[PDB]
Amino acid sequence: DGRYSLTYIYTGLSKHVEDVPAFQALGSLNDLQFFRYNSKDRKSQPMGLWRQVEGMEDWKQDSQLQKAREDIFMETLKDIVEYYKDSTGSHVLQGRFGCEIENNRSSGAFWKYYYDGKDYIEFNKEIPAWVPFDPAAQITKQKWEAEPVYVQRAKAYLEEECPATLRKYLKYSKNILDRQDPPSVVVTSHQAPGEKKKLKCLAYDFYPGKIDVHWTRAGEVQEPELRGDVLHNGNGTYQSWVVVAVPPQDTAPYSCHVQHSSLAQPLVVPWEA
Numbered sequence: 001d002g003r004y005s006l007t008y009i010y011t012g013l014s015k016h017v018e019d020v021p022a023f024q025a026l027g028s029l030n031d032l033q034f035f036r037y038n039s040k041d042r043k044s045q046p047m048g049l050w051r052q053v054e055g056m057e058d059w060k061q062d063s064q065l066q067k068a069r070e071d072i073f074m075e076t077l078k079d080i081v082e083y084y085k086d087s088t089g090s091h092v093l094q095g096r097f098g099c100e101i102e103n104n105r106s107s108g109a110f111w112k113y114y115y116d117g118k119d120y121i122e123f124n125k126e127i128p129a130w131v132p133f134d135p136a137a138q139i140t141k142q143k144w145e146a147e148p149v150y151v152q153r154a155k156a157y158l159e160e161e162c163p164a165t166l167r168k169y170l171k172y173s174k175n176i177l178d179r180q181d182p183p184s185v186v187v188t189s190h191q192a193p194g195e196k197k198k199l200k201c202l203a204y205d206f207y208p209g210k211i212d213v214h215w216t217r218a219g220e221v222q223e224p225e226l227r228g229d230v231l232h233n234g235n236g237t238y239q240s241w242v243v244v245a246v247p248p249q250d251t252a253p254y255s256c257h258v259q260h261s262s263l264a265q266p267l268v269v270p271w272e273a
């Protein structure tokens with residue numbers, strides 16, 4: 001088995017402006033975001049390729065969970081602002097947490113918060129306890145550890161629940177995270193009025209991201225004039241391109257090369273003038 005990671009990110013604004021939800025939540029599986037929630041629509045919604053997956057998560061029930069989390073998260077931010085006696089300004093709280101396994105073996109976990117960008121507080125499941133970084137975080141620590149069960153719970157989530165959730169998700173996400181969708185390349189050229197002609201090689205619909213793409217002018221690996229790539233989450237695919245300008249008086253042969261983990265041997269698409 002390989003590496004897989006479940007990560008959640010919560011963002012709250014104490015004084016949100018128009019069209020910007022006061023709270024937002026999102027979760028990623030490796031390099032793909034599989035869900036999102038916000039305080040406006042108030043609903044846990046699957047994303048990308050997970051929109052078509054069934055039986056992995058009762059989104060209607062998670063919606064309720066997210067509302068719960070939201071209330072706590074926002075109460076947390078509220079209290080910090082109360083602490084610094086400054087509710088006229090706008091402040092943000094960001095929570096990041098999750099776990100990761102490698103070879104069906106839990107290989108890591110984390111749970112930390114940031115207030116106005118600086119480290120606010122984090123959990124050390126080895127004590128187990130909360131570690132404060134900001135003075136206000138001391139008050140939070142006190143609250144979050146008022147009962148002995150609390151740290152036990154936080155610990156249980158990081159070492160049991162989260163990874164359990166990750167294993168489950170992996171079952172329903174094989175046809176997603178373990179894909180080897182080979183790239184469809186496409187060579188094309190454009191002549192800007194006044195400039196040299198330029199050749200653009202485009203590899204698309206491939207997954208994972210790691211990939212090699214370069215032009216060759218006479219079997220010689222050229223230096224790209226402009227490079228670029230992207231990730232389409234809804235699709236769950238990657239695109240990557242390279243461009244080269246060709247001398248107005250050049251006849252040499254131009255071919256595009258594309259190496260990808262899903263190819264038995266590299267691909268070569270020559271450009272026909």
Ligand SMILES: *[C@@H]1O[C@H](CO)[C@@H](O[C@@H]2O[C@H](CO)[C@@H](O)[C@H](O)[C@H]2NC(C)=O)[C@H](O)[C@H]1NC(C)=O
Pocket residue numbers: 205232235237239
């Ligand atoms: C995956 O999604 C991407 C983005 O929606 C698709 O890329 C577009 O493909 C159309 C052709 O149908 C092009 O005309 C667009 O220019 C592309 N969007 C851009 C600018 O990236 C891609 O076709 C989809 N492929 C799969 C496997 O469904």
Ligand SMILES: *[C@@H]1O[C@H](CO)[C@@H](O)[C@H](O)[C@H]1NC(C)=O
Pocket residue numbers: 104
């Ligand atoms: C780890 O994977 C095995 C199958 O490879 C599965 O039976 C097991 O339940 C998973 N996690 C553990 C150790 O329970």
